[PDB]
């Protein structure tokens, strides 16, 4: 019942609250489900500069209750802290949502055929060639041509 600690508008209590969460979030994944409305207070707060990290804990609760595309929306505005973590499983699940959203947008862009372009976030197209640098550095040529067929561009 630490949810009541979020009522205070003072920032330094929030970093100690999330410091508790992210460690035990594995066991408390069920507890974060009721923190939705009170996390948005921090995410929509202008004086709260951790909203990049607050978008991650907002993606964990929605992933717990069955929401997926909404977690991908928060992944956009989550800043560089979201795309800097390549570790374990969480990297391959987000790129499966992001690159599929990227490759279905590029096919849509080729149907314009020119002009009246849809908005393309620099973060979703930015990790394309960024993670593609891991290919040429790994020297494996077989899938180096595969990304070009994926994005179609």
């Amino acid at each position: 019942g630490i949810i009541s600690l979020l009522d205070e508008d003072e920032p330094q209590l929030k970093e100690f609250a999330l410091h508790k969460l992210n460690a035990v979030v594995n066991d408390f994944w069920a507890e974060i489900s009721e923190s939705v409305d009170k996390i948005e207070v921090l995410y929509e707060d202008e004086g709260f500069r951790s909203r990049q990290f607050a978008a991650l804990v907002a993606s964990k609760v929605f992933y717990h209750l069955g929401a997926f595309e909404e977690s991908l929306n928060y992944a956009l505005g989550a800043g560089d802290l979201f795309n800097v973590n390549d570790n374990s499983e969480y990297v391959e699940t987000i790129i499966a949502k992001c690159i599929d959203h990227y490759t279905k947008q590029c096919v849509e862009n080729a149907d314009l055929p020119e002009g009246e372009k849809k908005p393309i976030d620099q973060r979703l197209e930015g990790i394309v060639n960024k993670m593609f640098q891991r290919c040429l550095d790994d020297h494996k040529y077989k899938q180096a041509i595969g990304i070009a067929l994926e994005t179609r561009r």
């Binding site: 594995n26 066991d27 069920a30 507890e31 699940t93």
Partner: protein, 480 residues
């Protein structure tokens, strides 16, 4: 000595025959079954493994005894090796070591020496393919051995099993990941060992950290590979998160899903009993009575013996709070009889409205209720019986006076009777009108439910229930 000495040699060949061919025919058979097709799974040997392990869990496990030295554990765990068809030589070497027990002086390699033995499939260089067979080699020797329960220094070997088999979990998550179909075969094996996880801790201390380790395997099975896997993990949750506080009751809302599809059969039938006791603490009776009734009728096959009987005992507990229950000896079993005797006469005092008889049952039979933890209802069941007593009278009579039903139900006073009938109307229990002067209660027959209304409206749920089974039969027909 000569009589008992000559009778020692014959038995050990029996584990050298059937127990050999247990994992020789199934394991050697599941080899090609897990190399391809692999549809689903199926891999029926994993379900045949349910007909072995559970059969071995009585006799013989790996051991026994049997008047052997318990050398079957090191035998199959060494010299995997393996390679192309020479794996038969490994089974041939398993036959070669059978004479070692019968000829030379037999030595027990279990326990202390089992620590490097579980590393041998990795040390044999290499496995090289099936972790479930080595998971079986890290379980079937050790997990059926847990049934000894000596509690001294071998529990950490049961923990060492949960260690090196967590190294099999390391090979479970890292290896494959693409059309595995071994995980679905392991979902039966990973289930069991995760149950033995919970069981071994219960003898020492309930697991605080494994609760966090449970959500690990729980959440990671979604969405990548989940078939029957998260259900068994959700069973681990609702099992212990019930017996231990707190908040775990309402947790079922965000987890479900269901999780579909319910597997395997009776395995999900008991799950409705788990959440059944939960929803019983939510005080909602109607959803609790249907999930408890469905828990008995969906549960095959037993015997033996009281494992299904004891779970059925506490299952009809929700019927005590329903207010409508018959005598429960129609559910009695000669084995469950002796255990249900303090719980038997309880419901016999529920059918009656006597306080002196009901309070005497709580005093003498309250000792048996301490192990069940059912004391939550005994305070609210007094209000349940007074509703059954007034329903018995209100259904038997057109008009019922408050003064005549006062002492008959021994409410003893007119004022609290006005409070009960008021709350009875609030709960929709009674339709009786009341004429207050002294006062008295004058009711009338309730009718117009008739024919054209209730039966045809209920038949909307009956046919919608039946027409779905038409699809259930077609779906089940499409697999063959």
């Amino acid at each position: 000595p000569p009589g008992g000495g000559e009778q020692e040699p014959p038995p050990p060949p029996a584990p050298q025959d059937v127990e050999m061919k247990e994992e020789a025919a199934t394991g050697g058979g599941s080899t090609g079954e897990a190399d391809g097709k692999t549809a689903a799974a199926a891999a029926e040997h994993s379900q045949r493994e349910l007909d072995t392990v559970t059969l071995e869990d009585i006799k013989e496990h790996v051991k026994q005894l049997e008047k052997a030295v318990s050398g079957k554990e090191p035998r199959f765990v060494l010299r995997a090796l393996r390679m192309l068809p020479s794996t038969s030589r490994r089974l041939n070497h398993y036959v070669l070591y059978k004479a070692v027990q019968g000829f030379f002086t037999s030595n027990n390699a279990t326990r202390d020496f089992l620590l490097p033995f579980l590393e041998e499939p990795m040390d044999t260089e290499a496995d090289l393919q099936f972790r479930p067979r080595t998971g079986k080699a890290a379980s079937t020797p050790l997990l059926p051995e847990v049934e000894a329960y000596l509690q001294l220094l071998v529990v950490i070997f049961m923990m060492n099993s949960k260690r090196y088999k967590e190294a099999q979990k390391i090979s479970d998550d890292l290896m494959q990941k693409i059309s595995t179909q071994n995980r679905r075969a392991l979902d039966l094996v990973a289930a069991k060992c995760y149950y033995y996880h919970a069981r071994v801790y219960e003898f020492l201390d309930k697991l605080d950290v494994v609760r966090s380790f449970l959500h690990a395997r729980l959440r990671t099975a979604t969405l990548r590979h989940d078939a029957d896997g998260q259900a068994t993990l959700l069973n681990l949750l609702l099992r212990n998160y019930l017996h231990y506080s707190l908040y775990d009751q309402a947790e079922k809302l965000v987890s479900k899903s269901v999780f579909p599809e319910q597997a395997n059969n009776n395995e999900w039938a008991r799950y409705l009993y788990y959440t059944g006791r939960i929803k019983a603490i939510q005080l909602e009776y109607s959803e609790a009575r249907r999930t408890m009734t469905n828990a008995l009728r969906k549960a095959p096959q037993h015997t033996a013996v009281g494992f299904k009987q004891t779970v059925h005992k506490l299952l009809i507990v929700v019927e005590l709070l329903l207010g409508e229950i018959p005598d429960r000896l129609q559910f009695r079993q000669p084995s469950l009889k002796r255990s249900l005797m303090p719980y038997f006469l309880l419901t016999q005092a529920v059918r009656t409205g006597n306080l002196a008889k009901f309070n005497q049952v709580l005093d003498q039979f309250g000792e048996k209720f301490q192990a069940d933890g059912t004391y939550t209802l005994i305070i609210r069941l007094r209000h349940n019986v007074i509703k059954t007593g007034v329903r018995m009278i209100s259904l038997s009579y057109s008009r019922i006076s408050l003064a005549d039903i006062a002492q008959k139900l021994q409410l003893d006073s007119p004022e609290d009777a006005e409070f009960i009938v008021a709350k009875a109307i609030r709960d929709g229990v009674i339709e009786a009108s009341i004429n207050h002067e002294k006062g008295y209660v004058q009711s009338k027959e309730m009718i117009d439910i008739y024919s054209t209304r209730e039966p045809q409206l209920a038949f909307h749920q009956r046919i919608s229930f039946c027409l779905d089974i038409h699809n259930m039969s077609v779906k089940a027909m499409r697999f063959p």
